[PDB]
């Protein structure tokens, strides 16, 4: 995260770290959506142009964390993967369309002050909150510019779709939205390398619960003026999420 701040303890208890087994290292962010299901970006697991293809056994999930490097005895929990599911129409070839994947855990994690699932939006929350100008929050342990001691947080406003489109040569779809300040705005900030797969969340003013509206997906550079971060639109792919969780329990 660029131009963010130190998270408070327990401020993001759904945050998941995707950690490489050997050599042991941060791979990506992700989020806890029930006691056995973790949400992330498809490209964190599968991206052939970088010869990236991970399997279950290459990985572990670390939940409850705050420090990037430290092993947080008595606080974090570490989980093994039972099965990775990637969207059947994830477009890694052209633009990362439908950049989303689920990870099912071998065993349920135990909830605690530091571990708790975020909500997934219904159509009415989505319609009410996904508006240009509304701010969401992104969290993660990636670079501070183009690595932090602890989880970083930044609040960023959703950007009008014509401005998203005009900021890039990539073909933008309805399965994405972009977020960030304009140059004209003073304030800045952005996701960066290692933040991918983490959550974009909003707090509903209707029921005071946190909803995950986006997944950190891509950007050109980090925190460049006139460019914006792109997020997978979670509500738009929920049928597939639901589907996957239904059948695979």
């Amino acid at each position: 995260i660029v131009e963010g701040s130190d998270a408070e303890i327990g401020m993001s208890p759904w945050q998941v770290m995707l950690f490489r087994k050997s050599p042991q290292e941060l791979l990506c962010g992700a989020s806890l959506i029930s006691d056995r299901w973790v949400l992330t970006a498809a490209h964190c697991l599968l991206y052939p142009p970088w010869d990236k293809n991970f399997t279950e056994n290459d990985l572990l999930v670390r939940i409850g964390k705050h420090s990037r490097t430290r092993y947080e005895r008595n606080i974090e929990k570490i989980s093994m993967l039972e099965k990775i599911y990637i969207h059947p129409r994830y477009n890694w070839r052209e633009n990362l369309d439908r950049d989303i994947a689920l990870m099912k855990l071998k065993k349920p994690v135990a909830f605690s002050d530091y571990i708790h699932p975020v909500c997934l939006p219904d159509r009415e929350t989505a319609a009410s909150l996904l508006q240009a100008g509304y701010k969401g929050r992104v969290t993660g342990w990636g670079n501070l510019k183009e690595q932090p001691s602890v989880l970083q947080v930044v609040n960023l406003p959703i950007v009008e779709r014509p401005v998203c489109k005009d900021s890039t040569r990539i073909r933008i779809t309805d399965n994405m939205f972009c977020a960030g300040y304009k140059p004209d705005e003073g304030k800045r900030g952005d996701a960066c390398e290692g933040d991918s797969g983490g959550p974009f969340v909003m707090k509903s003013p209707f029921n005071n619960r946190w909803y995950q509206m986006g997944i950190v997906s891509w950007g050109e550079g980090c925190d460049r003026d006139g460019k914006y971060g792109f997020y997978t639109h979670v509500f738009r792919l929920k049928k597939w999420i639901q589907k996957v969780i239904d059948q695979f329990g």
Partner: peptide, 27 residues
């Protein structure tokens, strides 16, 4: 179900330091 309600914040009626920035944008 219990989702989206943080033990150290909503469940205690405590607010984090910048969540009001989000609220104030929901215009």
């Amino acid at each position: 179900a219990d989702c989206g309600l943080r033990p150290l914040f909503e469940k205690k009626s405590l607010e984090d330091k910048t969540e009001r920035e989000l609220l104030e944008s929901y215009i």
